[PDB]
């Protein structure tokens, strides 16, 4: 039973770590979207030139 308890703690820690990685990933996605907007702005600037 003690061994089972240790395994349960390990699984819980894994779930929490993955939950935090989700936040990291969505921040990266937001950065990529802003990069796309930056590229579109560059194209508009060339058109204006």
């Amino acid at each position: 039973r003690q061994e089972w308890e240790i395994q349960r703690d390990n699984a819980d820690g894994e779930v929490k770590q993955m939950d935090a990685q989700l936040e990291s990933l969505k921040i990266r996605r937001e950065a990529a979207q802003m990069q796309v907007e930056y590229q579109e702005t560059q194209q508009a600037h060339t058109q204006a030139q």
Partner: protein, 49 residues
């Protein structure tokens, strides 16, 4: 000759303004990158726990 010089100056000014706007967007992108690094630090803290 004067018309030619004036047109060149106007083009240079337009280039400078567009560069300024792009610089602002780059500022925002870099701030987002820093936030991502902070999220990675949080993930590491959970793993250490």
């Amino acid at each position: 000759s004067m018309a030619e010089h004036d047109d060149a100056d106007e083009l240079t000014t337009l280039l400078l303004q567009q560069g300024m706007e792009l610089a602002t967007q780059s500022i925002r992108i870099q701030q987002r990158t820093v936030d991502e690094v902070d999220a990675d630090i949080a993930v590491l803290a959970e793993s250490r726990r």
